[PDB]
Structure 1
Amino acid sequence: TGRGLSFLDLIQEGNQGLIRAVEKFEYKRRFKFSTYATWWIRQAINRAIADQARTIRIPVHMVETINKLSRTARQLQQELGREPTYEEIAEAMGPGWDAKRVEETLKIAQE
């Protein structure tokens, strides 16, 4: 809850994931059903959040990138005891990332 999707919506998409699990479940493996189901439900919920949470729709992998930028900035602000600069975030993101790309990513991610 709290990621932009209502409780009931998450419940329904989770139900869809449960359906997928039921269709894919192989009982011969002796693993309990909840084990297999949990992954599909989690996947369905995550996919739902990635898909429907924004008025301006953003591609799933791009959402992942945004979230990674978020967690990175959080870590950096946690170690530096203050909000990080674009250059610092670019450094922490590793290869391929400069300040321009971080800024553009933040701009694109604006709701």
Structure 2
Amino acid sequence: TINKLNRISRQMLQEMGREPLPEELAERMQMPEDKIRKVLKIAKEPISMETP
């Protein structure tokens, strides 16, 4: 789901020229916008406790 969201947001960005808003991404995925926001916020890799 994350990978194919990345690819669809890829294609939309390259076709319109700007970062696609979650509403248009949900429209292209045929999935609810709440699910799109859940996927987008799911888990970015934890930052290290030694970052200067």
2:41 counterpart residue number: 107
- TM-score, normalised to structure 1, is 0.38
Partners of 1:109 and 1:89 lie apart in 2 by 19
Shift of 1:99: 1.6
Identity %: 53
**Structure 1 runs of 4+ with >3 Å offset:** none
Q: What SS is found at the alignment partner of 2:18?
A: coil
Alignment gaps of 5+ in structure 2? 46-52
User: Quick check: which one's helix share is greater?
Assistant: 1
Q: Distance between the aligned counterparts of 1:74 and 1:68, measured in 2?
A: 9
Aligned residues: CA RMSD:
1.0
Higher RCO (Cα < 8 Å, 6 or more apart): 2
Structure 1 spans left out of the alignment, 5+ residues: 1-64
Whether 1:90 aligns to 2:23 is: no
Residue 109 of structure 1: how far off its partner (Å): 3.7
The structure having more radius of gyration, on CA atoms, is 1
Count of residues in correspondence between the two structures = 45
Q: Normalized against structure 2, the TM-score is what?
A: 0.77
